[PDB]
Each structure stands twice: as C-alpha cells, then as structure tokens.
Design a protein around this ligand. Structure first.
Ligand SMILES: OC[C@H]1O[C@@H](O[C@@H]2[C@@H](O)[C@H](O[C@H]3[C@H](O)[C@@H](O)[C@H](O[C@H]4[C@H](O)[C@@H](O)[C@H](O)O[C@@H]4CO)O[C@@H]3CO)O[C@H](CO)[C@H]2O)[C@H](O)[C@@H](O)[C@@H]1O
Ligand SMILES: OC[C@H]1O[C@@H](O[C@@H]2[C@@H](O)[C@H](O[C@H]3[C@H](O)[C@@H](O)[C@H](O[C@H]4[C@H](O)[C@@H](O)[C@H](O)O[C@@H]4CO)O[C@@H]3CO)O[C@H](CO)[C@H]2O)[C@H](O)[C@@H](O)[C@@H]1O
Ligand SMILES: OC[C@H]1O[C@@H](O[C@@H]2[C@@H](O)[C@H](O[C@H]3[C@H](O)[C@@H](O)[C@H](O[C@H]4[C@H](O)[C@@H](O)[C@H](O)O[C@@H]4CO)O[C@@H]3CO)O[C@H](CO)[C@H]2O)[C@H](O)[C@@H](O)[C@@H]1O
Ligand code: CL
Ligand code: CL
Ligand code: CL
Ligand code: CL
Ligand code: CL
Ligand code: CL
Ligand code: MG
Ligand code: MG
Ligand code: MG
Lengths: 336, 336, 336
C-alpha cells in the first residue's frame, strides 16, 4: 500500500529444523561437522516455478529421491526469468519449503543461480537466463540473509554456466570474471561465513584451467564442472583419452580444491530431447562415474524431471530413463 | 501519443520568484550574496508523495515552519520509489510548488536524493531506496536543468546515506565513492555552477574521516553529517567524550569545509517509533546543539512529520514532540 | 506460455534473396566484391514504427527511391523507444521486409542504432533515444546473428550521435568511447566478419579529430560524419573556409578510412521545422556535395519523410522540398 510501510525482510527460522550437520571445505575435500569426508551425490530437479505450474512442487518428490534413489543432495536451478515471474518473496517462500523437506529427510540443497552467458556484459544464451549484475548481487544478498545458519542449504552456486558463445556475447576475460566472483563471495561471506560458494569456469562451466595460475583468492570455496559427454572429443574413444582431456580442463582442480559436477548426464542420440552436448551411446556413464570416484568428485545429475532433458525419469511415476536407471544404481551403491 | 512528439523539457521560470539571495560556499563557511555568513537551520519534511497521499502537501506546512518554528531551510527527502511512482514530470511539478512557497517565505530548500546503500553496486537497505547509477545521474541531470539560476534551491544532496551494511551490500571503497561523487558534481556544474553539492561519507553518512587524506577534488561543495545519538558510543556519557568522538569522525570537517547535519534528532527509548540509532534520554539535544553552535555547523532536524520517526510533531496541528519542542526553541532563539 | 519453451532465434533465410554484391572496406575506400570502388549514395527514411503508424511502411517507398531518386542506399534510423515499443521480434520482422525490398531493387541498407547522447553514462538528449549498454549490445547481438551472410545489409552504424551536451550528460572521454566501440565491434565480428561497422565521434558525430592519434584499433571499419550546415561557423562564408573547417574536424578521415556522411541536409531558416543546426540559405548544398565528391565521401541525406525535418519531400506523393529537389538531381547525375 504505502511504500514506507513495506516490511524489512526476515530470516528463515532455524528452530523449525531438526539437527543436521553443516558441510564445510577442508583443503581439497568437503567434510561434515563431525570431521568425516563428505561427497555431494544427487540430482537436479526442475525450476521451482516449472514444477509449481503442474502441481509437482511437493515433498513427495524429495521423499522419492531420498528414499528410493540414494541421493544426499538436490540442486535447485533457479532461473532468473522464474525468479522475476513468481517474484522474490514468493520464490523464497517456496525455497523455504524445500529447506524444511530436505532437512526432514537429512539431505542437502545446492542453490544455483541458473543463467547461461557472460555476466560482465549482461548478455546471455536465451532470455530465460537474462539477468544483470545488480539482480545477481541482490539474489545472493537476499539468499544469504534469509538462510543464515541453515545447515541444509550447503552450496551457493554463483552462476550456472559462464560462456561467451565464441565471444559473440562479449570478450571472455578470466581476470574480470575472477574479480566479479570474488565480489559476490565478499557479499556472501559478509552475511554468512558457513556457506560454500561454488565457482565456474568458461566454456559453459567446463574449463577450470585458468585457476592453475589465477585461482579465486578466497578460502572455503569449491569449483563447478559440467562434464557433458560431447565436451571432450578424443579421436579414439576410450577411458584413457577421455580421462586425459577431462584432467586437462577440469579434473586437475580436484587435486587442490573440492569439485562438484553440478551438471552431467546423457541421452541416446536418437532419444528424447537429444541435443549437443548430451548425446552419447551410454558408455559415458560408467566412464564419468569411474573418473569421479577415482578423484573423489561430487555430483548432481541433470535432470530428475520427465520433460526437461536429458531426463532421469520418463513420467511422474518415476519410471527411470536409461541414464536414470544407471545413476540410480550408482547412487544406491554409494549410499551403502 | 507519438514518441517523436514528446516535448523537450522546460526550465523553472525565474521571473515567477521574488528577489532572494543566493547562498554560496566560501572556505569553511556558507555566505549569502551580500557577503554575510549564513547557516542553514531547519527541518526535514516527509517525501512529497507521502504528504500528497493524505493531502498534506500544502503551503500551510511551509508557512507554519517559517512563521512559527524559526526555520530558514527545509530538506526534501526525495525517495527513489516515490520519484518512480509519481513519475519525474509530476514529481518535478510538485517540487516547483515547494520552490514558489519557500521563495515567498524567504526560506531555502535542500533537495536530497534519499537513498540508503551503496550506489556503486546498486544495492540498498530497503526497496523504497532502490535506484541505479543511471537513474541517479538522470535525477541530477533533470533537477539541475530545471532549477538553473534559482536561489531558493540551495543544496543538491547527492545521496542521503552511503553504507554497505557491514559490507553485505558491497565492499566499501572510498576512491570509488569519491570518483562517483566527482562524476555527479561534474554533470551538475556543467549545467549550473551556482548550486552547492553536498557529499556524504560511509557508515550512513556518519564517517567523513576519509576526506582528511582524500577529499573530493572539486570546489564549492559542502559535506553532510548524520550525527544520530547512538552513533558515538562513549563508555562515559558526557560532553567531552561525545565531542571527541564526533570530532574524530565528522566534526573536524567543519574546520576546512562547510558541513550540514542533514539528519539529527532523537526519541525516548520507550517513545513513538523508537529504533537504533535515534534512541536517547534527551541529553543529546543540548549536547549536539552546543557542539554544532561551537563549530558553526548547519542542520536540518529529522523529521517534521507526525508519522515518520523520530517525529517533531504529534499531529497535523503541530503539537510538538519532545525533540520538536526542544529544537523549536533553539531555532527561534537562533533566528533572533 | 511456458518460458522454457520460448524458441531460440532464427537467422534470415539467405536463399530468399537474389544475387547481390557484398560491399567491403579496402584502405580508405569501399569496394564491391567485383573489386570496383563503391560509394553509398542515398537517404534516410523515418523509423520503421513511425512509418507503420500511418501505413507508410511499404515497398512502394523503396521503389520510389530506387527508381526515381537515384539512390543505392537507405539508412534506417532505429530509435530505441520504437525498438521497445514494437518489441525486438516484431521490429526484426519488419527489418526483414526492408531487406527483401532493398535486395529486389539492388540497393543497400545501413542499420543505425539511433540514439543521441553518451552511452558510457547512459544519459541522452531525449527519452526517445534512451538506451543502456546492455540493450545496445543486445541489439547488435540480435542484428548480427539474424543478418549473417546478407549482402543487402551493408553497414552497422553503432551509435548515431555521440554527445555529452557540453558535459551535462557525463565527461566526454575518447579512450572510454573508443574502448566501448571496440567492444561492440568484437561482438559483431565474432558473429559476422563481412559487415562494416560505422563509428562516430563526439559533438553529435561531427568531430572525428581524436582518430588522428587514437583511431579505433580494428580493421574493416568506416567513420560517420554529420556535417550539418551550422556545425562549421566561419566568419567569412565561402567554399575555402568551410572546406578548411570540415577538413580539420572530419574530412581528413577520408584520406585514411572510408567515411559516410550519414546525416546531412538543410532547410531555409524560415522553412518547415527549422532548427539548429540545419538552417541554411541553400548555398550549403552545392558546397557539401562539391566537398564530398572531391574526397570520395559516401552519404545519406536526412530525411526522406514529409513530417520529420529537414524534409526531402512535402507529402507522400513525393513532391520534393528545396533540399529534396537539389539532392535528387545530384544522386540521379551520380548514378549515371
Ligand atoms: O548449443 C551448443 C553448445 O551447447 C553447450 O552446452 C549447453 C549446455 O551446457 C546446457 O546445459 C543444460 C542447461 O544448463 C539447462 O538450462 C538445460 O535445461 C533445459 C532443458 O534441456 C530443456 O529440455 C527444457 O525445456 O528447458 C531447460 C531450461 O533450463 O539443460 C541443458 C542440458 O541438456 O544446455 C544448453 C542448451 O539448452 C547447451 O547449449 C556446449 O557446452 C557447447 O560446446 C555447444 O557449442
Ligand atoms: O538499522 C541499524 C543501523 O541503523 C543505522 O541508522 C539508519 C539511519 O541512518 C536511518 O535514518 C533515517 C532514514 O534515512 C530515513 O529514511 C528514515 O525514515 C523512515 C522513518 O523512520 C519511518 O518512520 C517511516 O515510516 O519511513 C521512513 C522512510 O524514509 O528515518 C531514519 C531516522 O529515524 O534510518 C535507518 C532505518 O530506517 C537506520 O538503519 C545506523 O547508522 C547503524 O549504526 C545501525 O547498525
Ligand atoms: O540542439 C542544439 C544542438 O543541436 C545539435 O544537433 C542535433 C542534430 O545532430 C540532430 O540531428 C537529427 C537527429 O539525429 C534526428 O533524430 C532528428 O529527427 C527528429 C526530427 O527532426 C523531428 O522533426 C521529428 O519529429 O523527430 C525526429 C526524431 O528522430 O533530426 C535531426 C536533424 O534535424 O537533431 C537534434 C535535435 O533534434 C540536434 O540537437 C548540434 O550538433 C549542436 O551544435 C547544437 O548545440
Ligand atoms: Cl566461453
Ligand atoms: Cl543438436
Ligand atoms: Cl559503510
Ligand atoms: Cl532497534
Ligand atoms: Cl560532445
Ligand atoms: Cl533552433
Ligand atoms: Mg547454509
Ligand atoms: Mg539554486
Ligand atoms: Mg551484411
């Protein structure tokens, strides 16, 4: 009504949660607050607004994943268009639901500001990802305040997929991107020092190689990787050659910092919603899992949804897709 | 209708005003155009839009202040949300009213772009204060053009209360803020060299100390200070200790440049709309007045409104509040 | 409907066009792809949205110009307010029409992002020109993608008229403007290397003199000039004195780079829609044409419209205005 009476914001009520360990960074590993090494293992679900539109934003979704798919983590890809469409207040109210659901089940959330493009020039792959530096800062300001001292919310993934699309969106420049990530980290750490910022490299969060010489100059962070099957292109398709290429671009990072592969997965080239870079004959599955397990790398498969591809499920009865069936058994075995 | 026919803007008609002295900066003082030392002494009123909503935007308001409260100055806190809500054209049309009313009564206006936060990152304490560098420049561009050669409009207070809220809004950086103020000053001086820009420091316009080594590198400006009672926190509460702390952070500035305390005031801790940093037992009143009178510091008390706190009045019949009664007698005595 | 289903954009179908030479830059000249020196000679028409509003956006308009006025070029001044009003999708669909019409007639288009002001501070002469760096980049991103490999679209005129209006809009700074143009060029060249970027100087695209020491550091570009009659102000009004002043500020550029005078023209001081800087007794016409022909300078007269001034026509039956009659004969003679 009267703009001067608009309330100041409130923080999530931590008393509403059951006891749950905080996850933290220690050297190249995540650890829980009992000191035990921890690996994020789980899935993406679709944007909250997408799920709400078909009445699929429900605790039953989290229960299925925790109880039947072996997950300890769900990644929420918050699309800026949806953040605007629902509005911050309403969107945050739904994130609160996810927090309570995850907490009840003893699982963790990665909050992902889900854009694709080059934030320093504010140019993007598609309008669903459109944002500004101002809006991006404000999202992280609001999130960090609201979820202060909440162990369930473990990771703040600052910007899903940095890319300039062959420099059509701007001139990719590591120093500039590094500085902007450091700026976001500083805002976050000023508000909550317990959360783990997750930083991505260029080429759609595939190339971490700039961190060899110029890593982000902040402690307690982890690095993202999106090792989709068609990103590495060896002439001879075997474990050794893929492993070497992955090592060069992103895997080396796990020697020094924790790494979360926050997107990975495949569909057959003639399968549902097939597109570059997610097409594969299936051999990628065992290979990427072997690689990640060798390096202790964390992961959230894309995507546990029957509409968005590559799918893990064929329907809302959770009939597994090819990749779904594969990762389900991997996660169930890892949980044991 | 057709965007190509939208008129270019017009300037305030100076022929509509009665003769009134221009106020200017000379060394550490303000002077009128007869050469006599001048002190701004007055009050804030509420945002124009707030007053309009209850039909309280009236000349009778200015008349009460000039005739009965001893003021020579009114500060208008133009909130960006209200600037947008009324629209520039309509808001400026109401500022024109204030100009004619003030001019008729021989009093002056401070125009305050009333935001709280960190403009370089475009992050703010509350959405009522939300703005951008672009909108802020445009506000000053429009204001400076419209009120060219108008003596009644004396001071352009560029940004009410700079703060990063413990670096949650961004990393406070004096060089960056100094440069941005210099940029705004350059736009203003390109359009009207007679106006006085008023520059604020960090910690909600409390800390001017960076100007000891790095003052804004422009002539004819003054500095703002917001010495609310709870800003200085001496262990022993007496004149000497408060004076020393005020000296350290803002009072020293008055030795070299003119200073306007554009917000100050108090309410009892159990009084109406009490909040940090405006709570005091009342002893602050005599103390801040003694301090300002000693240093020749100008001031506008916050706020001459019965709804917005700390109030100077309890109702629209102008029943004085505690601080209202106090400052009313101070201003009346100073006017004599 | 559902934002995740919003289509990715498509490119203009080059198979829809008849064969037409590409125009390119070679040293200080334009050449066609047969190697012959080429001069752009033509007119501006009004903004597409302006023409649509009165049902004047028609192929008949292009046919009149190509068949009866001797043009080989039409400049389209795309106003940001109109880009927003129609929306990118609809505006681009109308530009597609112009492409097909021009191509059919064997003539070329200059696409002009038609703003006036200082892009680095995002401050402008009038709201019809209002834009941001983000919107400007996005316009060029969309344009370059859509018209890839289209010979008909020859020139991308990045920003119509740079000016700070006496530094009221910001502090003019060549290094800053040069860098921003280079940034836009890099985005464009990443998407289509065949197009010709057209760069403007300060003082409403009049002053190219900064390029003597600090030219844009990219190949294949041309420079704009807007030599309106009142821009040069010799005390003695003859060819020699105007030529010298034009030489100093913009004409020298044609010695080293190709130049397009993308706005020029006049109306009598007591004529229709007369204003600075377009007022002249008519002697300017022969003088500017003589000057341009001497230097091999390309041009598009402002403006072939009966409402927008200075006009080339008095009505939609194409009754020529004074300047219209003059330039019509110049262009017809040049075409022969
Ligand atoms: O396009 C060629 C280039 O592709 C590059 O890979 C991109 C890839 O990283 C990206 O991965 C994710 C997106 O992050 C995610 O948003 C998207 O979700 C879609 C979903 O696929 C649709 O079914 C649904 O309707 O809408 C959602 C919207 O979020 O899922 C993909 C993984 O499938 O996807 C984009 C295209 O969407 C890829 O462009 C690659 O890195 C380059 O090498 C390549 O040139
Ligand atoms: O919040 C803790 C921190 O407070 C810091 O002080 C801030 C103070 O400087 C600021 O002063 C003014 C505002 O500038 C002014 O906008 C506000 O007006 C309110 C009014 O109080 C309400 O009654 C009304 O409904 O809405 C108007 C909107 O303009 O009045 C205050 C003075 O009372 O106020 C803010 C809070 O509003 C303070 O945060 C302090 O500097 C820090 O040390 C402290 O940590
Ligand atoms: O104003 C004083 C200053 O004028 C400066 O010249 C400007 C001049 O370059 C500019 O040229 C073009 C504009 O680019 C173009 O947009 C405008 O179109 C108008 C048209 O004139 C109207 O009839 C119509 O209704 O609306 C369109 C909107 O696009 O046409 C002019 C040429 O006539 O025009 C502006 C004013 O419109 C000039 O300010 C000059 O360079 C300075 O020296 C001078 O101080
Ligand atoms: Cl990239
Ligand atoms: Cl594909
Ligand atoms: Cl601060
Ligand atoms: Cl309080
Ligand atoms: Cl200029
Ligand atoms: Cl004029
Ligand atoms: Mg947390
Ligand atoms: Mg004035
Ligand atoms: Mg082309």
């Amino acid at each position: 009504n009267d703009w001067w009476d608009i309330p100041y914001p409130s923080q999530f009520d931590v008393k509403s949660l059951k006891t749950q360990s905080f996850i933290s960074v220690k050297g190249n590993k995540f650890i829980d607050d009992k000191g035990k090494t921890f690996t994020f293992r789980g899935v993406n679900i679709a944007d909250t607004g997408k799920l709400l539109s078909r009445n699929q934003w429900q605790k039953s979704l989290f229960e299925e994943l925790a109880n039947n798919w072996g997950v300890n983590t769900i990644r929420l890809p918050i699309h800026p268009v949806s953040w605007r469409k629902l509005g911050p207040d309403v969107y945050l109210g739904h994130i609160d639901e996810a927090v309570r659901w995850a907490n009840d089940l003893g699982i963790y959330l990665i909050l992902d500001w889900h854009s694709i493009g080059y934030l320093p020039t504010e140019q993007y792959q598609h309008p669903m990802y459109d944002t500004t530096i101002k809006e991006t800062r404000d999202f992280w300001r609001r999130i960090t305040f609201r979820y202060q001292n909440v162990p369930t919310v473990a990771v703040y993934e600052l910007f899903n997929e940095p890319t300039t699309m062959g420099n059509t969106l701007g001139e990719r420049n590591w120093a500039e991107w590094k500085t902007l990530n450091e700026s976001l980290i500083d805002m976050i750490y000023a508000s909550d020092k317990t959360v783990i910022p997750l930083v991505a490299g260029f080429n759609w969060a595939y190339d971490l190689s700039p961190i060899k010489k110029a890593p982000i100059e902040r402690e307690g962070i982890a690095y993202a990787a999106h090792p989709y099957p068609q990103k590495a292109k060896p002439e001879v398709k075997n474990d050794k050659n893929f492993f070497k290429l992955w090592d060069e671009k992103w895997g080396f990072a796990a020697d020094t910092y924790p790494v979360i592969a926050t997107q990975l997965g495949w569909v057959q080239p003639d399968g549902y919603g097939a597109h570059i870079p997610v097409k594969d004959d299936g051999s990628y599955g065992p290979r990427i899992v072997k690689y990640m397990q060798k390096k202790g790398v964390s992961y959230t498969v894309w995507v546990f949804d029957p509409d968005w591809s590559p799918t893990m499920i064929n329907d809302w009865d959770f009939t597994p897709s090819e990749q779904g069936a594969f990762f389900k058994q991997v996660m169930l075995e890892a949980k044991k």
